[PDB]
Amino acid sequence: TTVMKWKTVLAIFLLVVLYLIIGATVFKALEQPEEGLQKYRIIQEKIDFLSMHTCVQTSELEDLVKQVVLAIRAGVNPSGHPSQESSMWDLSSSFFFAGTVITTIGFGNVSPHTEGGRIFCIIYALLGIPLFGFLLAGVGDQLGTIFGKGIAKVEKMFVKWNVSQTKIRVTSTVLFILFGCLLFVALPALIFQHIEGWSALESIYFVVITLTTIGFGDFVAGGSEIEYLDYYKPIVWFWILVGLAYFAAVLSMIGDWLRVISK
Amino acid sequence: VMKWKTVLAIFLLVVLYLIIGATVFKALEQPEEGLQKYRIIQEKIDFLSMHTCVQTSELEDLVKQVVLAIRAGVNPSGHPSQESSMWDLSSSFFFAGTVITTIGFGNVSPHTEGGRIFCIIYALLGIPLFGFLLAGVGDQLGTIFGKGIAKVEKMFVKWNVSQTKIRVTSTVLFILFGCLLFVALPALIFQHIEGWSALESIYFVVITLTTIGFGDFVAGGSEIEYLDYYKPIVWFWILVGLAYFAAVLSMIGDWLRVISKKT
Ligand SMILES: CCCCCCCCCCCCO[C@@H]1O[C@H](CO)[C@@H](O[C@H]2O[C@H](CO)[C@@H](O)[C@H](O)[C@H]2O)[C@H](O)[C@H]1O
Ligand SMILES: [K+]
Ligand SMILES: [K+]
Ligand SMILES: [K+]
């Protein structure tokens, strides 16, 4: 029963509105030249195609472009030849989509695209999320206890050297943040970098988005039509599962930093 | 804090839930995909047969350019106007709110190596702050709801049933009131403004409030004229719905804790 007074919450609300306004202005400044280059590229490509081929007509070209856009919304890949029997909605991939929907990540790479699918998605999401929340809390507690006990043992071994009451806590917090961060985020980013054509920055951005639960869908593991291992979606989902508890703890630590900045 | 065995049992239950959901989704959704796959292949073959001059390699090059454009974030369906852009202040404000809220619609993404870094930094600092806002509003609403429950708690009138029946009825009434105010009335507003299917409107509202954020339907995705404050009002409704639902869930969680303590 925290019961923060109305003035405090409206202060936080004003802060949040300022935060979005600053974010919107910076994002507009960054995006506008890249968008301009994009707009020029597409206009130039359309003009070049029309000039190159007499047969093509603006109406027919627009119709083909519209059909391709509908295909992208549909989820079918227009490029080259799609395989009807394999490489789409594999038991692993559908499992991964179910894991994201319950996890709330929601990549958007694959969607129901049917009335029954949409109704199933709403019912399945509402039933699935409380269970996954309970599981996340339980896994977080178990991981926290095991990790803490391990730190306890390592510290107790190293407690005698350089004893300080400030340093013991600063070392414990820094050790937990870095040790968890390297395995949970740094190692998957490198593995993603090697397995797929994505650059290191893109891979790190992908890991931050999934662990953070934003799930933009700009980068999705397994999305590219390339050869994959037999069980790639389950291992990635399991990594997301273990990673989320630690990232939630990190979010709590940043929240604590914010509150302290409060006084 | 629960036993390790309980975590394994819940993990097994969630995995079985995921497998049954994945199988149902796969069976439910392969016919639509097949019809789509046939439609795209027929459209491409029809285009090739219709025009002799256009070769398959050129068609593939165009398809690759269009898919890159969709990934880039610029629609190719119609000739664009440089003055009007996707990264407008209202839309950028909506995207920033989406980032802090972890909805992650994904229609608009940084698509730049500086923008992506700013996105990770912005999301990490913003999200705990949004969490504190959500918790503060949730607890204030919980306090008003508790006072209202106490007000209706007295039952000296005719047909006063058990307290358990009363609490269940109050919870059901509150959930129905929230569902009507946020799940259904905005869905009708969205249906009116964007001409979406009646099922699609609730699907979008559930996804947005739930925070899964597939990106299939976005308030500002369609390129049609909109009110100047459409994106800010939509984000304001998202915040109000999330906060109210968070308050209701917190009240149920506290009551659940009490129930567990009892008997
Ligand atoms: C309890 C009544 C709900 C009945 C639902 C009937 C209509 C369906 C509308 C779906 C609304 C879902 O509303 C509920 O809101 C809470 C808000 O914390 C969401 O909770 C989510 O919030 C945060 C965002 O800050 C996420 O990072 C997190 O993954 C998750 O906990 C739930 O995912 C969702 O279950
Ligand atoms: K989320
Ligand atoms: K999300
Ligand atoms: K998302």
Numbering used by the authors:
A (entry chain A): 39 to 301
B (entry chain B): 41 to 303
Which of the paper's sentences describe this entry?
Tandem pore domain (K2P) potassium channels modulate resting membrane potentials and shape cellular excitability. For the mechanosensitive subfamily of K2Ps (including the TREK1, TREK2, and TRAAK channels), diverse stimuli control channel activity, including lipids, pH, heat, membrane tension, post-translational modification, and an array of pharmacologically active agents including volatile anesthetics, antidepressants, and neuroprotective agents. Two key regions of the mechanosensitive K2P channel structure appear to control channel function, the conformationally flexible TM4 helix, and the selectivity filter. Overall, this cryo-EM structure exhibits K2P architectural features consistent with prior crystallographic studies: a dimeric channel assembly with each subunit composed of four transmembrane helices, a domain-swapped cap located above the selectivity filter, and an extended membrane facing TM2/TM3 loop within each subunit.
Using single particle cryo-EM, we first solved a 3.27 Å resolution structure of TREK1 solubilized in DDM detergent in an unexpected conformation. However, unlike all prior TREK1 structures, where intermolecular crystallization contacts immobilize the TM4 helix in an “up” conformation, the TM4s in our cryo-EM samples are unconstrained prior to sample vitrification. As a result, we find that TREK1 exhibits a previously unobserved asymmetric TM4 “up/down” conformational state. This asymmetry is due to an ~11° bend in the TM4a helix in the “up” state relative to the TM4b helix in the “down” state. The apparent cause of the observed TREK1 TM4 asymmetry is the presence of a density non-contiguous with the TREK1 density map but near the TM4b helix, sterically impeding TM4b from adopting the “up” conformation (pink). This density extends directly below the TREK1 selectivity filter, occluding the ion permeation pathway. The TREK1 protein is solubilized in n-dodecyl-β-d-maltoside (DDM) detergent and a molecule of DDM easily fits the observed density if the DDM is oriented with its maltoside sugar moieties located within the pore and hydrocarbon tail projecting outward toward the fenestration. While the positioning of this pore-bound DDM molecule is inverted relative to the orientation of DDM molecules in the micelle surrounding the TREK1 protein, the presence of a detergent molecule within the TREK1 pore suggested that this site could be a target for lipids in a biological membrane. Native MS analyses of DDM-purified TREK1 showed intact TREK1 dimer with a charge distribution similar to results previously observed for TRAAK in DM detergent, but did not identify any lipids bound to the TREK1 protein. While prior structures of TRAAK channels also exhibited asymmetric positioning of the TM4 helices, this asymmetry has always been attributed to crystallization artifacts and has not been considered biologically relevant.
